[PDB]
């Protein structure tokens, strides 16, 4: 979308002022003008996945310096390094290796399933 406009000066007669006003009015009232497209964006963005599940490149979401794996309750995918996992209070009894945590959403943010 784009208006075609030229700044009006003292050399310009009442015809040229009339032409720029007609330009503005026609662009703002065409079929599927700016107003229509923005009302469509409001309607349609409301069925996107509005909350991130990856990062912006399609890798795992970052986290803060948690105390236990149960602290990451937001949904999506989380890489956890071996050194980190080895200091979590609730870690499984196994060799510390790098792991991914997938968090699955439920009925409340105080509960989740964790893989």
């Amino acid at each position: 979308m784009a208006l075609n406009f030229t700044t009006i000066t003292e050399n310009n007669v009442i015809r040229d002022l009339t032409t720029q006003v007609n330009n503005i009015g026609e662009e703002l009232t065409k079929e599927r003008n700016i107003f229509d497209i923005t009302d469509d964006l409001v309607y349609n963005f409301n069925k996107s996945q509005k909350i991130k599940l990856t990062d912006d490149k399609g890798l795992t979401k970052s986290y803060g310096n948690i105390t236990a794996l149960r602290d990451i309750k937001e949904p999506g995918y989380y890489y956890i390094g071996a050194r980190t996992l080895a200091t979590l209070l609730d870690r499984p009894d196994m060799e510390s290796l790098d792991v991914v945590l997938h968090v699955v959403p439920l009925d409340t943010s105080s509960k989740v399933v964790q893989h």
Binding site: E26, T29, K30, E31
Partner: protein, 176 residues
């Protein structure tokens, strides 16, 4: 003294009543100086340049610009970057319908195939005796009538597949 808005509505009702006599005409089969930018038209011209021919008007009615909800049970039109509504002749003064809608189409080769740059609509066109047909070259015409409206456009070609639709929304006085 000035003319009134309702006088213009009565003068559009007079124009719409003439419908059966109305003809599109096309002309200017050779170039302008710039083919992307034709000159503005001469209101003192009685006839097109380089006349190709004439075709009867397919549609004639009063109109005005459309708006919702009050037009949502009426006859809509689309033209020139807006929607419009056909106004019936008995409502004309109540709806303020000073505008005439005029349309014709040259379907394929029913006039000589080539190019045109002038489009106009004439009324009181009289064809020669034994020629009732709606598509005419200048030698089939007894009188061309009165050239009501015309425009200088960018050129158009015609071929058997193409239908050359041409139409205008006009009023007898564009402001006063």
């Amino acid at each position: 003294a000035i003319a009134t808005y309702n006088s213009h509505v009565e003068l559009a009702k007079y124009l719409v009543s003439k419908a059966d006599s109305v003809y599109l005409t096309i002309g200017k089969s050779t170039p302008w100086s710039n083919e992307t930018n034709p000159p503005q038209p001469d209101e003192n011209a009685t006839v097109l340049q380089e006349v190709i021919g004439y075709k009867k008007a397919t549609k004639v009615t009063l109109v005005r610009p459309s708006k919702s909800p009050e037009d949502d049970n009426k006859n809509l039109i689309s033209y020139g970057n807006k929607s419009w509504v056909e106004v019936t002749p008995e409502n004309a003064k109540a709806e303020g319908a000073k505008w005439v809608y005029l349309e014709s189409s040259i379907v394929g080769d029913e006039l000589p195939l080539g190019t045109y740059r002038q489009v106009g609509f004439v009324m009181d066109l009289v064809a020669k005796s034994g020629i009732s047909k709606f598509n005419l070259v200048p030698s089939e015409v007894e009188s061309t009538g009165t050239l009501l409206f015309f425009d200088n456009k960018q050129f158009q070609n015609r071929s058997e597949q193409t239908t050359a639709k041409e139409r205008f929304i006009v009023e007898v006085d564009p402001n006063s």
